[PDB]
């Protein structure tokens, strides 16, 4: 039976390179074009390129064009690609899947026939440090908006643990400087509101 | 490079029958028989469904068919059930010995009718920025769209995946960084159905 297995999760820092490995058994490894699929978390599949283990022969998505590496090891049946220079948005999970049969006479490596996929391997590319959060305020409806902190998760509370009834705190939403910011929610009063915040050893108030 | 267009979601109910379209070029999808589908739940690796437009691996189930007119290819799926319910990617020979995939469709199954999107916009010490908040709505599908009066702004704009709430729909928010601010609308869609909130 064809396995594909995967190296572990990555973390790095940008500018940086990661190799991530690709060990097939079951079948023969030189047979088979071995593409290379990645995925950024709630996005989309995204192609990066093939490779011949039997020649070496490569190609890569123009996208991806002097900045990936695809090389492989037949004596221990293992491909390799490795990114380099990496962004905040190379942040993704890396697939490796077996393609086509290898034909002289017949080009296949382009059949987008991918019958048996790597476990995957996470890499997870920030630049950003430990920074504490700002809190700001906004039937009636009411809440408070914190911006700019790092890392997760943060815990949120309303008049120090009483309210819960209708009390909405939405998932942090990353941003392209590495950031995070969420929001928690919950007329007629006569009250005082304050959301509770805890992170950064950062404990704030606020209505 | 430009993926294949795909519907950002569908939505059926368990026994009927659904589509899912996947759009490219003369110079791809209309070119060859070499379109490929597949399904992927959450935290595992994509699955083939459905290759060469229309044939079947074996050992998957005969109520995933495929078919393609023109430029478009198309994955049928007959006899909803709840494990269904996953994300679709069509995939095709892109000419050149290259590969593209579609951008993707959310496959749900309704276990509860369609709701909402309930939206609420703020306009907020730091006198920029703009808030959307979206939630109780599903299926867990929505794009936004945000406006400086009646003309739209695309820059400086970033938006949460969908979030699971725990009645089983979802919640999102979109967020807006500026300056200009000295009115301004939200605008969510939902099932091809667009909420507005004006500020």
């Not at chain 1, 030189?30 to 011949?52: C, F, K, S």
């Not at chain 1, 590496?69 to 390799?80: G, L, V, W």
């Not at chain 1, 209708?166 to 995070?180: D, E, I, N």
């Amino acid at each position: 039976q064809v396995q594909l297995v995967q190296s572990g999760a990555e973390v790095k820092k940008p500018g940086a390179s990661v190799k991530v490995s690709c060990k097939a058994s079951g079948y023969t490894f030189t047979g088979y074009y071995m593409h290379w699929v990645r995925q950024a978390p709630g996005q989309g599949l995204e192609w990066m390129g093939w490779i011949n283990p039997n020649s070496g022969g490569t190609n890569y998505a123009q996208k991806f064009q002097g900045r990936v590496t695809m090389t492989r090891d037949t004596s221990i049946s293992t491909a390799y690609m490795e990114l380099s220079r990496l962004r905040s948005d190379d942040t993704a999970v890396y697939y490796c899947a077996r393609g086509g049969w290898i034909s002289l006479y017949y080009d296949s490596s382009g059949y987008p026939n991918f019958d048996y996929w790597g476990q995957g391997t996470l890499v997870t590319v920030s630049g950003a440090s430990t920074k504490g959060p700002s809190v700001f305020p906004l039937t009636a409806a009411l809440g408070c908006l914190v911006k700019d902190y790092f890392p997760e998760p943060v815990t949120v509370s309303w008049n120090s643990g009483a309210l819960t009834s209708g009390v909405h705190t939405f998932p942090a939403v990353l941003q392209s400087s590495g950031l995070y910011s969420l929001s928690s929610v919950v007329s007629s009063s006569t009250q005082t509101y304050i959301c509770n915040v805890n992170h950064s050893n950062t404990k704030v108030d606020k209505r | 490079q430009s993926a294949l267009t795909q519907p950002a979601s569908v939505s059926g109910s368990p026994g009927q029958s659904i589509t899912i379209s996947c759009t490219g070029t003369s110079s791809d999808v209309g070119s060859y028989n070499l379109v490929s589908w597949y399904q992927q739940h959450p935290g595992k690796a994509p699955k083939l469904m459905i290759y060469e437009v229309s044939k079947r691996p074996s050992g998957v189930s005969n109520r995933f068919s495929g078919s393609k007119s023109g430029n478009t290819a198309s994955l049928t799926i007959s006899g909803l059930q709840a494990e269904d319910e996953a994300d679709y990617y069509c995939c095709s020979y892109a000419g050149s010995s290259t590969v593209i995939f579609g951008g993707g469709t959310k496959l749900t199954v309704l276990g509860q009718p369609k709701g909402a999107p309930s939206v609420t916009l703020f306009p907020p010490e730091e006198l920029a920025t703009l808030v959307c908040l979206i939630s109780d709505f599903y299926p867990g599908a929505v794009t936004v769209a945000w406006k400086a009066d009646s003309s739209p702004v695309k820059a400086g704009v970033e938006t949460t995946t969908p979030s699971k709430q725990s009645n089983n729909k979802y919640a999102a928010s979109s967020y807006l960084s500026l300056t200009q601010w000295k009115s301004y609308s939200c605008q969510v869609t939902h099932e091809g159905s667009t909420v507005e909130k004006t500020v």
